[PDB]
Write an enzyme that holds these catalytic residues in place. Structure first.
Site, PDB file in Angstrom:
ATOM      1  CD1 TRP A 131      24.336  16.712  30.116  1.00 56.02           C
ATOM      2  CD2 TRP A 131      22.761  16.200  28.607  1.00 56.02           C
ATOM      3  NE1 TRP A 131      24.787  17.143  28.887  1.00 56.02           N
ATOM      4  CE2 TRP A 131      23.842  16.839  27.944  1.00 56.02           C
ATOM      5  CE3 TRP A 131      21.654  15.785  27.857  1.00 56.02           C
ATOM      6  CZ2 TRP A 131      23.843  17.072  26.570  1.00 56.02           C
ATOM      7  CZ3 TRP A 131      21.654  16.017  26.488  1.00 56.02           C
ATOM      8  CH2 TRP A 131      22.746  16.655  25.858  1.00 56.02           C
TER       9      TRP A 131
ATOM     10  CG  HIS B 201      25.766  21.256  28.289  1.00 56.63           C
ATOM     11  ND1 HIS B 201      25.247  20.730  27.123  1.00 56.63           N
ATOM     12  CD2 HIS B 201      24.729  21.861  28.922  1.00 56.63           C
ATOM     13  CE1 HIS B 201      23.953  20.997  27.057  1.00 56.63           C
ATOM     14  NE2 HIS B 201      23.613  21.684  28.135  1.00 56.63           N
TER      15      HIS B 201
ATOM     16  NE  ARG C   9      28.078  16.726  31.516  1.00 62.18           N
ATOM     17  CZ  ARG C   9      28.377  16.353  30.280  1.00 62.18           C
ATOM     18  NH1 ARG C   9      28.690  15.091  30.028  1.00 62.18           N
ATOM     19  NH2 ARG C   9      28.390  17.247  29.300  1.00 62.18           N
TER      20      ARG C   9
ATOM     21  CD  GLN D 142      31.279  20.432  28.565  1.00 69.89           C
ATOM     22  OE1 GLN D 142      31.017  19.291  28.188  1.00 69.89           O
ATOM     23  NE2 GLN D 142      30.348  21.375  28.710  1.00 69.89           N
TER      24      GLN D 142
ATOM     25  CB  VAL E  90      24.257  20.000  16.152  1.00 62.50           C
ATOM     26  CG1 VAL E  90      24.939  21.319  16.478  1.00 62.50           C
ATOM     27  CG2 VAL E  90      24.724  18.874  17.085  1.00 62.50           C
TER      28      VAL E  90
ATOM     29  CB  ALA F  66      27.969  25.160  18.410  1.00 59.58           C
TER      30      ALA F  66
END
Ligand code: YSA
Ligand code: YSA
Lengths: 266, 266
Positions: free
Chosen positions: A65, A94, A120, A134, A177, A230
């Protein structure tokens, strides 16, 4: 007598920004699947944007990032429950942190969708912006499975491109995740795959960070026996291919000649 | 210098009729459960309004409805598939016929909701109109059960009156369902039950009438192995208790002083 073909009083005619239009259609689509729209803050704490999401400092994950760090005192950042949260301030890279904010403030099962402005520090070309949008999706509850995540995106595709549309999931990495995945939707009219976003089954450590934070706050744990998926997708990317916009940089250009072209689009 | 407190240019400010507002909220609520909104015609054939719905002539069932019969030639009434349908013309006494129109034109599974203007030849008091609005709901598919019908109405209630709200179903009669039911929702702020509408499991003969009509039209049968529930509720009745309107007769009064009071309400 009167010349009825003559121009009438010049009353102003407004319109909505394309991002607003696209966001609305996405929210409409997920609302039909039982998702509720909630927003989070743009200026976020390192805890919510990273640590809670299993992205610790000085590790390859962080290096993925490009973060904008902020400075200044007297700034009050409130937490999920209006508490005063601490930590290094930054612009959210994000919408994912809103995934932890919501969970500490609510109890499963639920389905949320959270559109938002993200930032970003990177070079802006025709498909990359330093400031874009987003849409996060989060569904937590007993028995939630990856098949449900696939089902959701399948619905997005059908709703966005008709019955001859289809989805494609491939494995990818996200500290938050496991399983992790990136996905694309088949755009029948354009004959090509569009890489929309990332997704997966919410990570065990994320659920742990949530309840741990809930305890500090005096709330009972709430995510011990549940699972969830998600996803996070690019609004501009979808708007571009949807409204035929060739350069992502137009969005924030403020050029009326550009904007006025969407007065019709809903 | 200028007196900034002075009245500005008198630009007009519009508003939406309360029925429109209430219809919108109901549609929003059911959209979140996966229902899609479709409308049908006000001038309907006796076949769709009655026969297809298992309400034959010269029987107690017919005697329950107060129908407005129409006359005049040259009038073209199109069927579900644009075909020219015949039969005695009438003003629909309920939105239920749209339940047969949709099924002949589509294939299960699906979830529709159909708001609409209905007509009945009866005396108008403070809670009765000869011209009012209903919202039909229809969900057809394999494995659909009355528990799903109860679940739907439960959601309506929660969405309409908050978590301390509840629903109540009692048996009632409708040639077009079996089981049949009438239902009320608990209005916590007002401390009393509101009888919203009727519902039940779509009747076997209705499904038979649908496929039979589909065959005449050359379509394959589509409702042999499915079940489904449907309901019909009064929009004005819900709007009244929701916006605090004391007399149903205000709705069609056209009085600006009355209407303008809802400029705020969304
Ligand atoms: N610089 C940029 N300009 C415009 N759009 C950009 C961008 N950087 C990224 N995007 C869009 O943002 C989408 C997702 O961004 S990402 O960095 O690849 N992935 C994330 O940020 C994660 N939060 C995605 C995610 C993954 C799993 C989840 O369970 C939830 C969310 C991309 O698919 C892309 O279309
Ligand atoms: N004259 C009138 N003025 C205002 N509102 C009226 C009215 N007559 C009826 N209503 C409203 O209309 C609702 C339903 O009307 S009804 O004649 O009782 N029932 C019907 O018409 C059926 N079609 C209901 C139905 C039953 C089962 C189903 O599976 C689907 C629909 C009532 O609950 C009431 O609130």
């Amino acid at each position: 007598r009167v010349d009825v073909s003559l121009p009438g009083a010049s009353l102003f005619s407004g319109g909505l920004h394309p991002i607003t239009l696209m966001e609305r259609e996405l929210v409409e689509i997920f609302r039909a699947l039982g998702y509720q729209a909630v927003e989070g803050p743009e200026v976020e704490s390192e805890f919510f944007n990273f640590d809670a999401l299993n992205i610790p400092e000085h590790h390859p994950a962080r290096d993925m990032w490009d973060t904008f760090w902020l400075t200044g005192e007297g700034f009050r950042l409130e937490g999920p429950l209006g508490e005063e949260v601490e930590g290094r301030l930054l612009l959210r890279t994000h919408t994912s942190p809103m995934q932890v904010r919501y969970m500490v403030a609510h109890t499963p099962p639920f389905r949320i969708v959270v559109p938002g402005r993200v930032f970003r520090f990177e070079q802006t070309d025709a498909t990359h912006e330093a400031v874009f949008h987003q849409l996060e999706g989060l569904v937590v509850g007993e028995g939630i499975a990856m098949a449900h995540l696939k089902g959701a995106i399948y619905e997005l595709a059908q709703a966005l491109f008709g019955p001859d549309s289809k989805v494609r999931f491939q494995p990818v990495y996200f500290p938050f995740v496991e399983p992790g995945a990136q996905f694309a939707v088949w755009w029948p009219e354009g004959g090509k795959w569009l890489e929309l976003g990332g997704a997966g089954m919410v990570h065990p450590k994320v659920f742990q960070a949530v309840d741990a934070y809930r305890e500090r706050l005096g709330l009972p744990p709430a995510y011990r026996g549940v699972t969830g998926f998600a996803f996070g997708l690019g609004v501009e990317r979808l708007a571009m291919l949807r409204y035929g916009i060739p350069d992502i940089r137009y969005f924030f250009g403020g050029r009326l000649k550009f904007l006025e072209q969407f007065k019709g689009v809903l």
